[PDB]
Design a binder for this molecule. Sequence first.
Ligand SMILES: COc1cc(Nc2c(C#N)cnc3cc(OCCCN4CCN(C)CC4)c(OC)cc23)c(Cl)cc1Cl
Ligand SMILES: COc1cc(Nc2c(C#N)cnc3cc(OCCCN4CCN(C)CC4)c(OC)cc23)c(Cl)cc1Cl
Length: 261
Amino acid sequence: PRLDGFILTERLGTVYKAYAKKDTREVVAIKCVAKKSLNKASVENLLTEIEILKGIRHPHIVQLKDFQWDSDNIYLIMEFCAGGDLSRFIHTRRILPEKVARVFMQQLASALQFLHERNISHLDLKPQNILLSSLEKPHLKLADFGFAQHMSPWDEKHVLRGSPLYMAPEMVCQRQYDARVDLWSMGVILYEALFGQPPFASRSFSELEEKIRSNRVIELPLRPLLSRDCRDLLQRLLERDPSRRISFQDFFAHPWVDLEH
Ligand SMILES: COc1cc(Nc2c(C#N)cnc3cc(OCCCN4CCN(C)CC4)c(OC)cc23)c(Cl)cc1Cl
Ligand SMILES: COc1cc(Nc2c(C#N)cnc3cc(OCCCN4CCN(C)CC4)c(OC)cc23)c(Cl)cc1Cl
């Protein structure tokens, strides 16, 4: 068995806020899923997610504190993030100034380098999956490892993974992909922070699909005005051909990011 060790206090969205019986200052968010709701596939994917999360600890990744179950449900017991999600942070400001976006991208890059060096791909990077430690001067943390996979540079995958407005175009267009899809998604996040919406925002799904399958190079809006190094990074992340896209190593070393310094 049963959900043990926690006092539930509030519905957050099903997700509950709770505190540990042994340390009442330790606050957690508990995601509750009905076993009825899950495929054979989905049971198998949930097990790979838990195995991925149990082995990692990083200041920019939401920590799995515990995993439990009873007769009817599974419970993912996560580090509580009091600042909400990056989606809301952006939308309530409309757009972020370049200087703010830069600090944010450097934090996200630290987490992506940690995962890449362990041959882990997240595969669903987006602002709704990035949580904030507080409302002002936040620390950003990666959430929702539900699509994450073990992937070294050798591995080629086929099953679609991620979210329509964030997915690298080779997933739809070529029906095969590799770890470099996550650099596309990082490009989308940065574009959304600076301009207010993903580059393929559309009135219908059919309109979005046309944009995904187009060969037209992405045109960065000319307002707001951004630094040359910002534009250079953006343009190289948002390359449609993964073989032409900026490398992981080159992304981590880019002067606008500069993860070593
Ligand atoms: C995306 O994926 C996942 C998301 C979650 N969900 C959360 C995790 C995690 N992880 C951590 N901390 C959370 C904190 C939350 O709210 C904080 C308070 C925000 N304010 C409330 C007051 N009003 C006025 C302004 C906004 C929260 O709220 C919905 C959900 C949280 C989980 Cl448990 C699992 C997965 Cl897979
Ligand atoms: C697998 O991956 C992805 C697939 C999609 N694609 C679509 C999603 C989704 N998702 C949802 N709904 C869609 C609806 C569509 O057509 C509706 C209009 C039908 N016709 C109108 C004209 N009359 C004569 C014939 C019928 C559609 O058409 C091409 C594509 C859709 C996207 Cl957008 C992204 C990702 Cl990642």
